[PDB]
Design a protein around this ligand. Structure first.
Ligand SMILES: *[C@@H]1O[C@H](CO)[C@@H](O[C@@H]2O[C@H](CO)[C@@H](O)[C@H](O)[C@H]2NC(C)=O)[C@H](O)[C@H]1NC(C)=O
Ligand SMILES: *[C@@H]1O[C@H](CO)[C@@H](O)[C@H](O)[C@H]1NC(C)=O
Ligand SMILES: *[C@@H]1O[C@H](CO)[C@@H](O)[C@H](O)[C@H]1NC(C)=O
Ligand SMILES: *[C@@H]1O[C@H](CO)[C@@H](O)[C@H](O)[C@H]1NC(C)=O
Ligand SMILES: *[C@@H]1O[C@H](CO)[C@@H](O)[C@H](O)[C@H]1NC(C)=O
Ligand SMILES: *[C@@H]1O[C@H](CO)[C@@H](O)[C@H](O)[C@H]1NC(C)=O
Ligand SMILES: *[C@@H]1O[C@H](CO)[C@@H](O)[C@H](O)[C@H]1NC(C)=O
Lengths: 173, 53, 108, 173, 173
């Protein structure tokens, strides 16, 4: 909930579903159930693929030989090569550690962003036809079947379908 | 080849524009120079995405 | 009836980057940070000329090899120019110790 | 559309306008047209100026001489100086490559952010007086001339100007 | 106002309050006053604590001895050790400078984010019961005492408390 959801207006996650990292939970007379949003989920996971390829690949690992050794009349070169190597070691260490911290933060923000985007997509169809409730959910002043669910998933509603039923069932409130 | 032309940094493969920070071109340099990498390209965005329809 | 809309820019451009979440990603405007190009010349610093050996080695340069132009007028310069495989080493051979050190001292 | 617009609720860009990276498209009886938002656009581009100055300038390029050479009894120093230089080369390479990736991402997010901000600024004047439509646009329950356009650009509307016309032309809907 | 508030819909800050970086300003018949949001403020400041610990600590500073010296038959090693040290110096310099710039940007965005989140939390209780006004503030179609203030601070309102008073005092508008 950097951008307002996760520990934001939403409090916690759900273990009911495993097929995909995102989805919806549908609730109607036929029953309840969880169902995953493979479109945006797969796009995001492709982003993570390109990330981790774009972290691993950016090294070039030579056919390397690290070690050396010296006598005790080479102490210039000993304390040098120690300073040299410790310098390099620390720089890779520092940069990579910061990179793990930052990249994981930007990953959290990427996820938070995607769910926030989707939350507005859910909103954009059903603006006056159905209301914000509580947190995490919208209530319909009309009714919705599994076709209405799967339609609302893929970015389709037919706004004038239940515009009037919401226009009437609002008006007691 | 050798020439009367002028520069601010130099390498065997040619004389170099010292304007920009980096090359990937050849490590050896003399002067007020870029820095080398082993890479193909580096291009920052100024603008943003292009989609007509 | 009337309408207001947002707007932003696109163009005919097809220049691209790599990015964390997508590759070859097209944009309108870009800037290349890199100088991937060389003029294929030996220019000179600042108005200060470099030194040239042509065919000579540094041995043939410093010592006074007659086929190497001594060029005492060359009092200071921008940088040293050799080839990798200098033709005119020493006409009477001999070990030349600390070639490295002398070159490094004569870096500048 | 990290934050919801570009490939978000907006699908694509427009080639009609070239004077500035952002703007509006006005539509009324006198005609249509595109017009750029030089205020926020110029502020952002000043940000990019300070960026690129704050990338280029942060180097210090010495009056440098790179190369060395050695005999074959110096192989300690040869394999050293190779390891040394390759280490440095790779570190600049890695850090700079990550920096291009990250900075371009943050640039995309900077742009996306700015248009989202402006979208809420457009919303903030015309909240109940005119409606969200589709994507990218608002429809007026009243009418708007070029003065109304340029006023709405610079952050001015006079809310009670057409509050009543929207109060009536809403009510058929 | 990356995300829309600070130099966004809000113009500037306030010197009236010092106890905490965030808060509210309450206005009712008993009077006016400023009051700080120690919950989210303390959570954020804990985040800054973990940040700065996670910047400082990530170094390892050896029991170090920097300097060396050489004669004039060691110029390989002199120009080396100069190149070496200047390389390291510049790399720490570059990475750290970029890190200050980036981290301060992400700090600004962290703050901007938190206030935006809180702005939606204020909205979420009082949606139709009280209106957006101007910028920075909401006006009530009903009345609110200090208990109502402190309740609305900790995430509590009782929505049907003044739902009807807003339902009537709206309707002249
Ligand atoms: C450098 O070495 C080349 C060897 O390739 C020399 O080339 C000769 O040039 C003369 C005319 O100047 C010709 O008569 C020879 O036939 C060339 N030989 C070859 C093998 O090309 C060149 O002269 C040398 N330059 C200097 C300044 O010493
Ligand atoms: C969207 O879902 C509806 C039913 O829910 C279906 O008829 C339609 O073909 C779907 N469209 C796409 C593009 O998947
Ligand atoms: C050097 O590069 C700058 C920036 O790309 C350019 O303005 C200038 O014309 C270039 N000069 C040469 C000689 O390449
Ligand atoms: C794109 O437009 C620019 C500016 O008009 C022009 O320089 C360029 O050649 C054009 N490219 C193509 C492929 O039309
Ligand atoms: C960019 O990469 C994607 C990867 O699938 C590919 O579909 C697309 O054709 C590529 N475009 C260009 C111009 O290389
Ligand atoms: C804003 O635009 C209106 C007309 O659209 C103009 O009269 C007014 O002076 C403008 N204000 C500023 C501050 O530019
Ligand atoms: C919230 O505030 C109300 C009064 O404003 C108080 O009665 C209640 O105990 C508070 N709850 C918490 C959890 O602090």
């Amino acid at each position: 909930g950097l951008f307002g959801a996760i520990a934001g207006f939403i409090e916690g996650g759900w273990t009911g579903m495993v097929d995909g990292w995102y989805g919806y939970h549908h609730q109607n007379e036929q029953g309840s159930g969880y169902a995953a949003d493979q479109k945006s989920t797969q796009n995001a996971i492709n982003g993570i693929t390109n990330k981790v390829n774009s972290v691993i690949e950016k090294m070039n690992t030579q056919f390397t030989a690290v070690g050396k050794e010296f006598n005790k009349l080479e102490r210039r070169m000993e304390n040098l090569n120690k300073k040299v190597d410790d310098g390099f070691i620390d720089i890779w260490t520092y940069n990579a550690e910061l990179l793990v911290l930052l990249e994981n933060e930007r990953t959290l923000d990427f996820h938070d962003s995607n769910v926030k985007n989707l939350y507005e997509k859910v909103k954009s169809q059903l603006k006056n036809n159905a209301k914000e409730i509580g947190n995490g959910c919208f209530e319909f002043y009309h009714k919705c079947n599994d076709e209405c669910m799967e339609s609302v998933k893929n970015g389709t509603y037919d706004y004038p379908k239940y515009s009037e039923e919401s226009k009437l069932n609002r008006e007691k409130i | 080849p050798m020439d009367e032309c002028d520069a601010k940094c130099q390498t065997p493969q040619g004389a170099i524009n010292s304007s920009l920070p980096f090359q990937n071109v050849h490590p050896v340099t003399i002067g007020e120079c870029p820095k080398y990498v082993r890479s193909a390209k580096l291009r920052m965005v100024t603008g943003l995405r292009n989609i007509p329809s | 009836e009337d309408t207001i809309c947002i707007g932003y820019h696109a163009n005919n451009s097809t220049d691209t980057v790599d990015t964390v979440l997508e590759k070859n990603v097209t944009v309108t405007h870009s800037v290349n940070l890199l100088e991937d190009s060389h003029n294929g010349k030996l220019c000179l610093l600042k108005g200060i000329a470099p030194l040239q050996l042509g065919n000579c080695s540094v041995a043939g340069w410093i010592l006074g090899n007659p086929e190497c132009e001594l060029l005492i007028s060359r009092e200071s310069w921008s940088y040293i120019v050799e080839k990798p495989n200098p033709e005119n080493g020493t006409c009477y051979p001999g070990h030349f110790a600390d070639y490295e050190e002398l070159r490094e001292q004569l870096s500048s």
